[PDB]
Amino acid sequence: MWELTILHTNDVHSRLEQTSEDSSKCVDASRCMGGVARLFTKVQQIRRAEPNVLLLDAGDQYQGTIWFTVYKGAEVAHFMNALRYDAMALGNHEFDNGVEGLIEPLLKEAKFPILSANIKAKGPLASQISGLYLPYKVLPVGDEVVGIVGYTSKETPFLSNPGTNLVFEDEITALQPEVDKLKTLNVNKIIALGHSGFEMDKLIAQKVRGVDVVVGGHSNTFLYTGNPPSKEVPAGKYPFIVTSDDGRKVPVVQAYAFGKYLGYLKIEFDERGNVISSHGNPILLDSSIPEDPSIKADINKWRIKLDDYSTQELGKTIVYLDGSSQSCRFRECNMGNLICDAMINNNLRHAFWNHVSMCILNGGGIRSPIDERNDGTITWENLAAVLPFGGTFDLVQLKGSTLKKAFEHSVHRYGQSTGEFLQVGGIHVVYDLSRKPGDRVVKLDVLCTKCRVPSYDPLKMDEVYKVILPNFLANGGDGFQMIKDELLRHDSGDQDINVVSTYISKMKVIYPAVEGRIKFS
Amino acid sequence: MWELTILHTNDVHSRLEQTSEDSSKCVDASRCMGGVARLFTKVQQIRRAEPNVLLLDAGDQYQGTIWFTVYKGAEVAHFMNALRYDAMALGNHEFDNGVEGLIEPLLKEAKFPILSANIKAKGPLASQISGLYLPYKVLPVGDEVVGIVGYTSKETPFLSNPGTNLVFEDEITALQPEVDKLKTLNVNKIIALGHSGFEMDKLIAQKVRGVDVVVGGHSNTFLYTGNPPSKEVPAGKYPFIVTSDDGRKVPVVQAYAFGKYLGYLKIEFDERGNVISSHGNPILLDSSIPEDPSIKADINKWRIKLDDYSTQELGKTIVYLDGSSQSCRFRECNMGNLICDAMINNNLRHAFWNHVSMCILNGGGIRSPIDERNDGTITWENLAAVLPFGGTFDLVQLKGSTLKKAFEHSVHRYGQSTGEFLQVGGIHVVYDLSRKPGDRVVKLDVLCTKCRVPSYDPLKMDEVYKVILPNFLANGGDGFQMIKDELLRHDSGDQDINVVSTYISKMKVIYPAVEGRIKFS
Numbered sequence A, B: 001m002w003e004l005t006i007l008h009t010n011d012v013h014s015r016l017e018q019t020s021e022d023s024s025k026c027v028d029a030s031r032c033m034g035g036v037a038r039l040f041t042k043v044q045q046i047r048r049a050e051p052n053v054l055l056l057d058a059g060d061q062y063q064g065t066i067w068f069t070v071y072k073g074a075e076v077a078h079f080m081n082a083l084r085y086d087a088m089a090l091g092n093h094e095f096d097n098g099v100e101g102l103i104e105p106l107l108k109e110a111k112f113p114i115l116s117a118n119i120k121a122k123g124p125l126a127s128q129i130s131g132l133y134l135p136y137k138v139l140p141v142g143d144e145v146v147g148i149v150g151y152t153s154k155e156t157p158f159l160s161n162p163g164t165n166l167v168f169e170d171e172i173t174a175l176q177p178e179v180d181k182l183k184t185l186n187v188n189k190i191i192a193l194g195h196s197g198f199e200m201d202k203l204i205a206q207k208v209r210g211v212d213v214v215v216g217g218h219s220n221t222f223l224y225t226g227n228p229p230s231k232e233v234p235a236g237k238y239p240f241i242v243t244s245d246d247g248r249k250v251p252v253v254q255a256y257a258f259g260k261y262l263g264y265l266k267i268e269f270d271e272r273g274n275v276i277s278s279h280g281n282p283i284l285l286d287s288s289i290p291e292d293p294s295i296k297a298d299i300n301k302w303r304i305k306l307d308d309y310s311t312q313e314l315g316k317t318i319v320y321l322d323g324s325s326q327s328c329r330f331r332e333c334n335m336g337n338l339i340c341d342a343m344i345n346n347n348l349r350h351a352f353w354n355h356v357s358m359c360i361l362n363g364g365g366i367r368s369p370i371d372e373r374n375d376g377t378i379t380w381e382n383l384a385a386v387l388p389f390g391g392t393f394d395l396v397q398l399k400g401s402t403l404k405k406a407f408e409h410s411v412h413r414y415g416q417s418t419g420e421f422l423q424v425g426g427i428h429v430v431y432d433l434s435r436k437p438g439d440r441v442v443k444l445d446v447l448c449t450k451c452r453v454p455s456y457d458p459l460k461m462d463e464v465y466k467v468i469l470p471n472f473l474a475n476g477g478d479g480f481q482m483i484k485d486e487l488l489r490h491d492s493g494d495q496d497i498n499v500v501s502t503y504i505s506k507m508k509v510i511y512p513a514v515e516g517r518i519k520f521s
């Protein structure tokens, strides 16, 4: 019997340096976690101890911190090569800077194979990207070979900017012929490594004949066997076992996000590549694991270029700016109220009509909290992690019916850590989750524009309201198809980080609170 | 039979120039009201038409606009002499600048008798103020004489700064011997002119034998017979008839406030001074009445010194700043939310503990609205009328029990246009007016200080909270005795107008709304 050790990371999101426990900028260095230097110490320790080791990434290394704003993927290719990753699957955020933002910094500079079987290149692009990413790779591991098939979220054209020359096929339809090709090459050990979320990973384990292990990403799934070591609540045991349609037990693994944990799974295979057993758990990369000095000195060299983004203080916060998913995707979060107050302030600074009183913001668009214990200081860097996408805060004209539909969509699948949960400004919404989806909004009061003194009045279906929202939502992003389809007017506004930055500078000291903007019945 | 015409003003409050309909600074001159120039045209017209005329003031000429901030009462003595007032009764605001602020500008410069029978001077002051104000005056009117007895609110030591050398006696106890003295002088026509409010005026008409007419002030009572000409709702017919204990019908009159109306009452007396009948109504001093050119040119001369208080713009409002009594004494008003946000902002600008999240503000302390149609401009003058008293915004430490008592007091006599109604910041209060007084607060949630993210939690009786409030409330003003008696700590803060001014300058453009801080069940 032959034992393989799979070490996996996913949704790291430019978290190259060690972070606070909430994955925001490290301040109190003694209690910091993750980062590539720490991950390198743990990986090295496992390589010294285990004979057959694979270090894999299931996508979304791109986007999240000033590391990616400045280096545009050169930091990813450099440090992923430094850690000696054996393979990576393409994620949706790898396309955020177009195909060009993927090809030049990453595909051309990685010393490891970058995979995706369901991505087909066509037209002019076909010749330009050919062989820069592969559907599968056969990797020698000790005296054995292990086949790795890659996959990327089929919904990527709506999540990113991959362009019109890439076709995103159904994962299962595209993976089965590639697995069948590995089987003809007599590769009997097969890992499906990809980026579509835990729900699709379970479908790949059930339906794709020949896959032994599924290593996923995109849904930031925390899986654990026993008592977890930190604040993350497990969504199931590690590994998650799926029984395939052909009757084989298939472990499905995921390792949360932000490089806080290193996934770790041991598979005992027999001579014919049948999985005998599997055990593991994600490894919390805390303070106990010391950062590698060589990687850390290299991280510090690259850090010089970034320091001029933290030299200038925009203002102060005397309160924790809760930009976490556990807060901003489930209820009113003060980071969400702050950003919506900044949007309304930027639009009301230059103004019955002409005015704009309301704001809506997808909770999943807020990508990091900001801590108040660092002397209170807010820099362009702390703000760069909250709002990393470089989008705009647009003005839209919506019928009350359209706004009520967007609010119904906001909680249609409440309890899935779905980022469509809306943060608001100039709106008082009450939800009753005991009611059937599509009828959960029990109260929707909005701030009048056509009134001398502003006050909250019930939303009228036949009335038309002006709403400030991300360009992402206006384009039907996060399943807000009703906004794109039913809007009556759409104007482009200022860059997201600049709107929030000018506001923080004006206010000097900020203290946003949870005020009852969103309530539950 | 002999007919007397009584023209009366009360609670003018430094409204020397014509004002908007809400009694704030005149902008659209075509639809402006009141002012001394307009009042002079109407009074002159009545003097040309009627043989026996008395022009009286029932108090509170002092405090309200930049006219009083700058001239400290010299404008009152000058323009009241110009209009040829025959008498004035002392009001509580005439003592706001101490006895010295009353003696030097007004008592020493008025060419008319200034009256109060229930104010007794003692100790060192007795010799200094002797004869500068009188208990009564006998005025020749045509071939007849009319006696005028004055009175001032017994509660003045708590409302103002009259000092420890003036005794404020019971109105009825002090008025009866002065009326009896006029009766021995065979004065058969007697007017009681004073400043204690409509409720006390009715008691004087009922109890003081020999008073024929009561001309009052202090409660800003609007009395009208028929259909009123403006937005003011009558509190009863004009005149209000009180049947005395000795069986005589006694008219009681009051003419609202801010010089918007001129009270006008005709009394037909018989040969023995018995009131036969009385009819009248307040005269709305609107645009139809033209301003006297001589008084207006004199008003413009004095206006030069004031212009450097309007030359500098503090910021802009895009919304009407509702500082009216009809709003701020009955429900949440946006002027109240603004001032409470300015108080919390001034105290949080330099800060679990040390912080202050809550604000309370007596609604009656907000003395004027600000209009947004004047290009949006907010000047030191517009702000001077909102906050004319020159008080401070103090920090106090209160038990939850004390705060609940202050909120119970806030609505104990709801529906009387009582200024104790509280405006708030960092507090969510719900009242149920159908409940018995002392038990009307059904919900009282406050913003936590001892929490990383601020949020609204129920008030705990056994807990201690930090509240920013006017120095007036800390001293038990407006019947908030529980604040003065039960507070655990009291620190003096910055001047009220400066706190609000620095905030408006920081914000640049303001838009406070009615947000659900105060609700009714």
Ligand SMILES: O=P(O)(O)CP(=O)(O)OC[C@H]1O[C@@H](n2cnc3c(NCc4ccccc4)nc(Cl)nc32)[C@@H](F)[C@@H]1O
Pocket: A011, A060, A092, A093, A095, A096, A097, A159, A160, A161, A218, A219, A220, A362, A363, A364, A365, A389, A391, A418, A419, A420, A470, A472, A473, A478
């Ligand atoms: O890491 P992911 O692959 O995104 C999976 P997740 O559970 O961590 O985050 C999902 C949430 O994030 C929201 N979201 C993602 N990208 C964007 C985004 N920009 C991405 C982008 C799109 C097109 C071109 C370039 C960049 N803008 C906004 Cl406002 N919201 C976004 C939105 F997609 C959702 O609420």
Ligand SMILES: O=P(O)(O)CP(=O)(O)OC[C@H]1O[C@@H](n2cnc3c(NCc4ccccc4)nc(Cl)nc32)[C@@H](F)[C@@H]1O
Pocket: B011, B060, B092, B093, B095, B096, B097, B159, B160, B161, B218, B219, B220, B362, B363, B364, B365, B389, B391, B418, B419, B420, B470, B472, B473, B478
């Ligand atoms: O014109 P008035 O004689 O006052 C009768 P009104 O029905 O028009 O106003 C009553 C309201 O006004 C409130 N109030 C009055 N004076 C003050 C005041 N300053 C007066 C003062 C007191 C002592 C010395 C000097 C000035 N400060 C504050 Cl915050 N609130 C006040 C307080 F008294 C009440 O809520």
Ligand SMILES: [Ca+2]
Pocket: A188, A189, A190, A210, A212, A272, A273, A274, A275
């Ligand atoms: Ca196998």
Ligand SMILES: [Ca+2]
Pocket: B188, B189, B190, B210, B212, B272, B273, B274, B275
């Ligand atoms: Ca008489």
Ligand SMILES: [Zn+2]
Pocket: A011, A013, A060, A093, A218
């Ligand atoms: Zn991701």
Ligand SMILES: [Zn+2]
Pocket: A060, A091, A092, A093, A195, A217, A218
């Ligand atoms: Zn993803």
Ligand SMILES: [Zn+2]
Pocket: B011, B013, B060, B093, B218
């Ligand atoms: Zn008054």
Ligand SMILES: [Zn+2]
Pocket: B060, B091, B092, B093, B195, B217, B218
């Ligand atoms: Zn008064």
